[PDB]
């Protein structure tokens, strides 16, 4: 329904206490206005960097917000996608 496909993933395998990158990527979403919020432990992660809104040759739009974090035992990470009025929350998964 123009609804984002969102994946939340880590650059390299989680190794606790070893630096990594936390990645939330949404594509294929019809109204191009979209919000992407990286969540550590239910909280919004600051200083996160976003790519620019753009698209593929097939005109489908794309956004990617990411941040360097260090995975720690106990810690949990997710993504709030606010698209078209709705927020949805994807966990690493």
């Amino acid at each position: 329904p123009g609804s984002p496909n969102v994946q939340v993933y880590t650059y390299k395998l989680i190794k606790e206490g070893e630096s990594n990158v936390l990645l939330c990527h949404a594509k294929d979403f019809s109204p191009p206005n979209i919000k992407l919020e990286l969540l550590e432990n239910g909280r919004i992660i600051p200083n996160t960097t976003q790519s620019d809104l753009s698209f593929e040759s097939d005109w489908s739009f794309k956004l990617t917000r990411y941040v360097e974090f260090t995975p720690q035992s106990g810690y949990k990470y997710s993504c709030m996608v606010t698209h078209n009025g709705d927020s949805k929350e994807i966990q690493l998964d």
């Binding site: 650059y11 390299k12 990158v21 990645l23 191009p32 809104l53 753009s54 698209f55 990617t64």
Partner: protein, 257 residues
């Protein structure tokens, strides 16, 4: 090989969340720069764009956006308001394929109507979707003022060679993937998922598949390719093993390496 210089615009006038114009632009894979209406100057998106690239590129790139803005977006903005057009996607690209022949196009995906494929060697615009005064309106923008089409065809390929030379290092890097195979928790849609995870590989060209007894399993093949953060790529391949011995399954992966 072939090499394309793309600039990917987004036009969204009076959009409350988005600005009027975004720009992007990517030497192949590599996003090389970015402009939008708030920023008031282009910004580069690779270090080597910021270093191995003349300043005189950026003052003239800077002028180039105005041209598309002034010779196109302004002239049709009256029209789009009338058609209740919410936004337009504009791809402007030139390509130099094994130096055989050269194509520079310009496409516009008017939202709701189709795309206007304007060929800038023949200087003629075709409708790829709904026909309307726009297809020819921009033909006639491009037929008159031939100086402007001198920024979108010929400077496009010289700028390609410039940036192609600045970026030759980058576009040639070879990040090597790590092929990892996980059994994924039994989800709602497959009963026993098997993921093959291939992450950090820079040449996007890649050939991977799952095999069972050599035979290529294609039944429950789910295939994703996601961007990384450092211009490399990520690939996931899922299959429902459906309670077959997983030792019999193998993920063959050919990357340039």
């Amino acid at each position: 090989g072939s090499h394309t210089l793309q600039y990917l615009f987004i036009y969204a006038p009076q959009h409350p969340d988005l600005p009027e114009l975004s720009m992007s632009g990517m030497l192949d894979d590599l996003q090389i720069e970015y402009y939008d209406s708030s920023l008031k100057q282009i910004q580069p998106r690779q270090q080597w764009m910021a270093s191995k690239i003349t300043e005189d590129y950026w003052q003239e790139q800077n002028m180039a956006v105005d041209a598309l803005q002034n010779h196109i977006f302004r002239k049709i903005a009256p029209l789009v308001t009338i058609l209740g057009i919410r936004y337009i996607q504009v791809l402007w690209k030139c390509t130099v394929e094994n130096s055989q022949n050269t194509t520079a196009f310009v496409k516009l995906n008017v939202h709701g109507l189709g795309v206007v494929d304007c060929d800038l060697f023949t200087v003629r615009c075709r409708g790829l979707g709904v026909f309307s005064v726009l297809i020819g309106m921009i033909e006639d923008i491009l037929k008159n003022d031939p100086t402007f089409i001198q920024l979108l065809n010929p400077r496009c390929v010289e700028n390609l060679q410039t940036v192609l030379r600045a970026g030759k290092t980058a576009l040639e890097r070879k990040v090597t993937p790590q092929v990892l195979v996980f059994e994924r928790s039994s989800t709602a849609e497959m009963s026993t998922p098997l993921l093959c995870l291939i992450t950090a590989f820079y040449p996007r060209t890649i050939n991977a598949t799952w095999l069972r007894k050599g035979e290529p399993v294609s039944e429950d093949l789910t295939v994703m390719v996601l961007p990384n953060h450092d211009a490399t790529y990520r690939m996931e391949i899922l299959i429902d093993i459906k309670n077959n011995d997983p030792s019999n399954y193998y993920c063959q992966v050919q990357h340039c390496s």
